[PDB]
Design an enzyme around this catalytic site. Structure first.
Site, PDB file in Angstrom:
ATOM      1  N   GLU A   1       0.783  -1.206   0.000  1.00 44.90           N
ATOM      2  CA  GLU A   1       0.000   0.000   0.000  1.00 44.90           C
ATOM      3  C   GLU A   1       0.834   1.286   0.000  1.00 44.90           C
ATOM      4  O   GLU A   1       0.650   2.156   0.839  1.00 44.90           O
ATOM      5  CB  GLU A   1      -1.016  -0.028   1.156  1.00 44.90           C
ATOM      6  CG  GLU A   1      -1.897  -1.258   1.117  1.00 44.90           C
ATOM      7  CD  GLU A   1      -2.881  -1.332   2.285  1.00 44.90           C
ATOM      8  OE1 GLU A   1      -2.792  -0.493   3.240  1.00 44.90           O
ATOM      9  OE2 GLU A   1      -3.749  -2.233   2.239  1.00 44.90           O
TER      10      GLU A   1
ATOM     11  N   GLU B   1      -4.386  -9.062  -0.197  1.00 42.46           N
ATOM     12  CA  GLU B   1      -5.170  -8.977   1.035  1.00 42.46           C
ATOM     13  C   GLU B   1      -6.659  -8.793   0.741  1.00 42.46           C
ATOM     14  O   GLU B   1      -7.072  -7.955  -0.084  1.00 42.46           O
ATOM     15  CB  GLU B   1      -4.747  -7.809   1.935  1.00 42.46           C
ATOM     16  CG  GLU B   1      -3.336  -7.814   2.473  1.00 42.46           C
ATOM     17  CD  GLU B   1      -3.038  -6.579   3.303  1.00 42.46           C
ATOM     18  OE1 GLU B   1      -3.995  -5.885   3.715  1.00 42.46           O
ATOM     19  OE2 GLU B   1      -1.851  -6.300   3.587  1.00 42.46           O
TER      20      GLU B   1
HETATM   21  O1  LIG Z   1     -15.755   2.772  -1.407  1.00 47.75           O
HETATM   22  C1  LIG Z   1     -16.147   3.235  -0.110  1.00 47.75           C
HETATM   23  C2  LIG Z   1     -15.677   4.661   0.254  1.00 47.75           C
HETATM   24  O2  LIG Z   1     -16.864   5.468   0.388  1.00 47.75           O
HETATM   25  C3  LIG Z   1     -16.806   6.719   1.102  1.00 47.75           C
HETATM   26  O3  LIG Z   1     -18.096   7.381   1.032  1.00 47.75           O
HETATM   27  C4  LIG Z   1     -16.343   6.382   2.529  1.00 47.75           C
HETATM   28  O4  LIG Z   1     -16.411   7.430   3.523  1.00 47.75           O
HETATM   29  C5  LIG Z   1     -14.892   5.951   2.392  1.00 47.75           C
HETATM   30  O5  LIG Z   1     -14.348   5.794   3.718  1.00 47.75           O
HETATM   31  C6  LIG Z   1     -14.793   4.671   1.535  1.00 47.75           C
HETATM   32  O6  LIG Z   1     -13.405   4.464   1.153  1.00 47.75           O
HETATM   33  C7  LIG Z   1     -12.585   3.898   2.192  1.00 47.75           C
HETATM   34  O7  LIG Z   1     -12.080   4.873   3.111  1.00 47.75           O
HETATM   35  C8  LIG Z   1     -11.482   4.227   4.234  1.00 47.75           C
HETATM   36  C9  LIG Z   1     -11.146   5.302   5.243  1.00 47.75           C
HETATM   37  O8  LIG Z   1     -12.238   6.251   5.277  1.00 47.75           O
HETATM   38  C10 LIG Z   1     -10.266   3.393   3.788  1.00 47.75           C
HETATM   39  O9  LIG Z   1      -9.832   2.633   4.888  1.00 47.75           O
HETATM   40  C11 LIG Z   1      -8.629   1.891   4.696  1.00 47.75           C
HETATM   41  O10 LIG Z   1      -8.713   0.690   3.911  1.00 47.75           O
HETATM   42  C12 LIG Z   1      -7.383   0.158   3.779  1.00 47.75           C
HETATM   43  C13 LIG Z   1      -7.303  -0.930   2.698  1.00 47.75           C
HETATM   44  O11 LIG Z   1      -6.713  -0.200   1.621  1.00 47.75           O
HETATM   45  C14 LIG Z   1      -6.797  -0.672   0.246  1.00 47.75           C
HETATM   46  O12 LIG Z   1      -7.935  -1.513  -0.023  1.00 47.75           O
HETATM   47  C15 LIG Z   1      -9.262  -0.973   0.019  1.00 47.75           C
HETATM   48  C16 LIG Z   1      -9.343   0.233  -0.904  1.00 47.75           C
HETATM   49  O13 LIG Z   1     -10.586   0.831  -0.577  1.00 47.75           O
HETATM   50  C17 LIG Z   1      -8.165   1.208  -0.705  1.00 47.75           C
HETATM   51  O14 LIG Z   1      -8.091   2.287  -1.643  1.00 47.75           O
HETATM   52  C18 LIG Z   1      -6.816   0.501  -0.784  1.00 47.75           C
HETATM   53  O15 LIG Z   1      -5.825   1.577  -0.698  1.00 47.75           O
HETATM   54  C19 LIG Z   1      -6.895  -0.331   5.151  1.00 47.75           C
HETATM   55  O16 LIG Z   1      -5.571  -0.880   5.029  1.00 47.75           O
HETATM   56  C20 LIG Z   1      -6.936   0.769   6.230  1.00 47.75           C
HETATM   57  O17 LIG Z   1      -6.867   0.196   7.545  1.00 47.75           O
HETATM   58  C21 LIG Z   1      -8.223   1.585   6.136  1.00 47.75           C
HETATM   59  O18 LIG Z   1      -8.153   2.851   6.841  1.00 47.75           O
HETATM   60  C22 LIG Z   1     -10.643   2.391   2.696  1.00 47.75           C
HETATM   61  O19 LIG Z   1      -9.510   1.691   2.184  1.00 47.75           O
HETATM   62  C23 LIG Z   1     -11.418   3.095   1.600  1.00 47.75           C
HETATM   63  O20 LIG Z   1     -11.928   2.090   0.739  1.00 47.75           O
END
Ligand SMILES: OC[C@H]1O[C@@H](O)[C@H](O)[C@@H](O)[C@@H]1O[C@@H]1O[C@H](CO)[C@@H](O[C@@H]2O[C@H](CO[C@H]3OC[C@@H](O)[C@H](O)[C@H]3O)[C@@H](O)[C@H](O)[C@H]2O)[C@H](O)[C@H]1O
Ligand code: MG
Length: 339
Positions: free
Chosen positions: A149, A271
Site C-alpha cells: 500500500e 489482502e
Molecule cells: O468505497 C467506499 C468509500 O466510500 C466513502 O463514502 C467512505 O467514507 C470511504 O471511507 C470509503 O473508502 C474507504 O475509506 C477508508 C477510510 O475512510 C479506507 O480505509 C482503509 O482501507 C485500507 C485498505 O486499503 C486498500 O484496499 C481498500 C481500498 O478501498 C483502498 O483504496 C486501498 O488503498 C486499510 O488498510 C486501512 O486500515 C483503512 O483505513 C478504505 O480503504 C477506503 O476504501
C-alpha cells in the site's frame, strides 16, 4: 506470454497473511518487533496449521525500517534478516506458496513524494538487493511483493489511489524493485515479482495509470476489502450480507478484468477479509460472492489474519495462534472450500 506466472498461481487454493507480526513496528531494531503488537512468536506449528487447513499459500508481511542501518546502504540487521528467513523457511518446509513483502515502510521512509523519486527508489532497491541476495536459492514458490500500500499517509487521496504524479512515482518504484531483484540473478532471474498500484487501490483511474513491465514474470497485486462498509467497522458500516451489494464487488472486478486479466496480466489479491461482527452466516455468504467472483478467472486471494477476534481491534483473526484452533470454522470452511 506471461503463462508461466498463471501456472504457478493456479497451484494456490487460497492464501493466508501472517498479520501483525513481522510487519509490527514496536521493539525498535530487534527481533522482538515480531511480538510487539501482542502476537506470539511465529512457530513451525502455526504455519503447519494454516497449510493443513488448506491455505497452501502464505503472505509474510514484514516491516524493515527499524531494522535498517543508515542510508545509503540501509543494511538489514543480520538478526532481523535471519528471523525473516526462519519464518519463510517454515513455509518452505511445508511446500507452500509464499509472498514476502515490505510492509509498513509507509510509516517511515516510504512517503510518496514525487519530488523525492530517486531517494525512494534507491532505498527500495537497496532493501530488495539484500533480500534477493538472501533468498537467491529459494525456488519459484517464493514470490516477492515489492511494496505494501505505497502511499502518502495523511493525504486526501491516501485511500483512493492518490494523485497522478504519485502514480507515475509508483511506476518508477515498481521498476526499481524489479530491476534490483533481477540484477541479483540465480532464482531471482525469473521469480514471480508482484508489483502494486498506489495504495494497492483498484479504482479505474488508479489501474489506468499503471505501467505494465515488459518483464514477463510479474503479477499485479491489489487489496480489496469490498465492500468497505461490510468488511470494516465505521459510521455507515453494516454486518448483513444479503447479496444486494454484490454489484460493488462485480463492478470493481470488471475494472480489474478490463485493465489486467483481459490483457493477459496476472493479478493477485494479496489482502482481503471481513472483520468479525457476530455474523458468521453473512461472512460465509460474502465469501461466496467475493471469492466466487475471483474464481471466475482463476484469480487468487490471500486473507488478512491479524489474530484479533475476541479482543478489541479490527477482528480479522481466523487462526487462534496460541491454541492452534480456528476461531470460526464456518468462515474458514467457506474460504478453504471455495472451489
Ligand atoms: O468505497 C467506499 C468509500 O466510500 C466513502 O463514502 C467512505 O467514507 C470511504 O471511507 C470509503 O473508502 C474507504 O475509506 C477508508 C477510510 O475512510 C479506507 O480505509 C482503509 O482501507 C485500507 C485498505 O486499503 C486498500 O484496499 C481498500 C481500498 O478501498 C483502498 O483504496 C486501498 O488503498 C486499510 O488498510 C486501512 O486500515 C483503512 O483505513 C478504505 O480503504 C477506503 O476504501
Ligand atoms: Mg534458473
Amino acid at each position: 506470454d506471461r503463462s508461466r506466472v498463471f501456472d504457478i498461481l493456479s497451484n494456490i487454493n487460497i492464501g493466508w497473511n501472517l498479520g501483525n507480526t513481522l510487519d509490527a513496528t514496536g521493539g525498535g531494531n530487534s527481533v522482538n518487533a515480531e511480538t510487539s503488537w501482542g502476537n506470539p512468536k511465529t512457530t513451525q506449528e502455526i504455519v503447519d496449521t494454516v497449510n493443513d487447513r488448506g491455505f497452501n499459500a502464505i503472505r509474510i508481511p514484514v516491516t524493515f525500517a527499524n531494522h535498517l542501518g543508515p542510508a545509503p546502504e540501509y543494511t538489514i540487521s543480520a538478526d532481523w534478516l535471519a528471523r525473516v528467513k526462519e519464518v519463510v523457511d517454515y513455509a518452505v518446509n511445508d511446500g507452500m506458496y509464499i509472498i514476502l513483502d515490505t510492509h509498513h515502510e509507509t510509516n517511515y521512509w516510504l512517503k510518496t513524494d514525487p519530488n523525492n523519486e530517486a531517494a525512494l527508489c534507491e532505498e527500495l532497491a537497496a532493501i530488495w538487493k539484500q533480500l534477493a541476495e538472501a533468498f537467491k536459492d529459494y525456488d519459484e514458490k517464493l514470490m516477492f511483493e515489492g511494496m505494501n500500500e505505497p502511499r502518502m499517509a495523511g493525504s486526501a487521496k491516501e485511500w483512493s489511489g492518490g494523485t497522478p504524479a504519485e502514480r507515475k512515482l509508483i511506476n518508477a518504484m515498481n521498476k526499481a524493485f524489479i530491476d534490483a531483484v533481477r540484477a541479483t540473478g540465480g532464482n531471482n532471474a525469473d521469480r514471480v515479482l508482484i508489483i502494486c498500484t498506489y495504495g494497492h487501490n483498484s479504482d479505474e483511474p488508479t489501474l489506468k495509470d499503471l505501467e505494465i513491465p515488459s518483464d514477463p514474470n510479474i503479477a499485479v497485486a491489489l487489496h480489496t476489502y469490498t465492500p468497505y462498509f461490510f468488511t470494516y467497522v465505521a459510521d455507515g458500516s453494516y454486518s448483513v450480507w444479503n447479496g444486494s451489494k454484490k454489484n460493488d464487488i462485480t463492478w470493481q472486478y470488471n475494472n480489474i478484468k478490463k485493465y489486467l486479466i483481459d490483457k493477459g496480466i496476472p493479478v493477485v489479491i494479496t489482502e482481503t477479509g471481513a472483520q468479525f461482527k457476530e455474523n458468521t452466516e453473512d461472512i460465509v455468504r460474502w465469501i461466496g460472492d467475493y471469492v466466487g467472483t475471483l474464481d471466475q478467472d482463476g484469480v487468487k486471494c490471500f486473507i488478512w489474519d491479524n489474530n484479533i477476534y475476541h479482543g478489541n481491534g479490527e477482528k480479522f483473526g481466523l487462526l487462534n495462534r496460541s491454541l492452534l484452533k480456528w476461531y470460526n470454522d464456518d468462515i474458514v470452511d467457506a474460504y478453504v472450500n471455495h472451489a
